[PDB]
UniProtKB/Swiss-Prot annotation, chains A, B, C, D, E, F:
The lineage of its organism: Eukaryota, Metazoa, Chordata, Craniata, Vertebrata. Cu cation binds at H14. It is linked to Genetic alterations of SNCA resulting in aberrant polymerization into fibrils, are associated with several neurodegenerative diseases (synucleinopathies). SNCA fibrillar aggregates represent the major non A-beta component of Alzheimer disease amyloid plaque, and a major component of Lewy body inclusions. They are also found within Lewy body (LB)-like intraneuronal inclusions, glial inclusions and axonal spheroids in neurodegeneration with brain iron accumulation type 1. Highly expressed in presynaptic terminals in the central nervous system. Expressed principally in brain. The 'non A-beta component of Alzheimer disease amyloid plaque' domain (NAC domain) is involved in fibrils formation. The middle hydrophobic region forms the core of the filaments. The C-terminus may regulate aggregation and determine the diameter of the filaments. This is Alpha-synuclein. The chain holds residues 37 to 99 of 140 of the full protein. Residues 1-31 are annotated as: 4 X 11 AA tandem repeats of [EGS]-K-T-K-[EQ]-[GQ]-V-X(4). Neuronal protein that plays several roles in synaptic activity such as regulation of synaptic vesicle trafficking and subsequent neurotransmitter release. Participates as a monomer in synaptic vesicle exocytosis by enhancing vesicle priming, fusion and dilation of exocytotic fusion pores. Mechanistically, acts by increasing local Ca(2+) release from microdomains which is essential for the enhancement of ATP-induced exocytosis. The modification Phosphoserine is found at S51. It comes from Homo sapiens.
Length: 63, 63, 63, 63, 63, 63
């Protein structure tokens, strides 16, 4: 009736300072799923299921 | 009836400073799914399921 | 009736400073699921089931 | 006689990523010297004295 | 006679990621010297005296 | 005669990730010297005296 949100923050990322020094970063996928390198990600949902980094190498649901 | 959102923030990313120094970054996919390098991503949904980095190498649902 | 949220914070990440120095980072997936490298991630859901890093190498649910 | 410099670096700045969010930045000088905001500066000298941010509010060397 | 510098680094700054969030930054100098905000600075000298952030509010050397 | 420097590093700063969140940063100098905010600074000298953050409020050396 009188909802008030003044300085609400929801699913927020701020003030993030990252450094990554690699001489070799090697991914080798052979018939699967791979999820790497997720940085400073924000998500908000209203009535919904939400993933961020979901990995399923594959699925076998024949017949 | 009297909803008020004054300085609301939802699914927000700000003030992000990243550095990535690599001498070699090599991805080798062979018959799958791969998701890399997701930085400073924001999503907001209203009545909806939302992924951000979903990986399924493949699917076998014949017949 | 008179909900008031003044400086609410929900699912928030801030003031994060990370450094990663690797001479070699090698992932080798062979027929599975892999989830690596999740940094500074925020999620908020309203009526929804939400993962962040879910890994299922595969699934065999034939017939 | 056989000086060799192959990949020498001297007075070098690289790979710098900065963010500055200010709602008000106010400097008020009244009869002096002020030095602010020096970012990603490189200097190299050969036989010479070199400052980068030297401040002298004033000098009184009469007579 | 056979000086060799292969991958020498001297006075070097690299891979620097900084974030500065201020709601008010106020400097008020009244008859002096002030030095603020020096970030990612490199200097190399050969036969020379070198400062980087030297502050002298003033000097009184009359007569 | 056969000086060899292969991967020498001298006066080097690298891989620095800093965050500074201030709601108010206030400096008030009244007739002096002030040195603040020195981050990721490198200096190398050859035959020379070198400061980095030297503060002398003032000097009185009359006569």
């Amino acid at each position: 009736v009188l909802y008030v949100g003044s300085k609400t923050k929801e699913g927020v990322v701020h003030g993030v300072a990252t450094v990554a020094e690699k001489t070799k970063e090697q991914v080798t996928n052979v018939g699967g799923a791979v999820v790497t390198g997720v940085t400073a990600v924000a998500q908000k949902t209203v009535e919904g299921a939400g993933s961020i980094a979901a990995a399923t190498g594959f699925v076998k649901k024949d017949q």
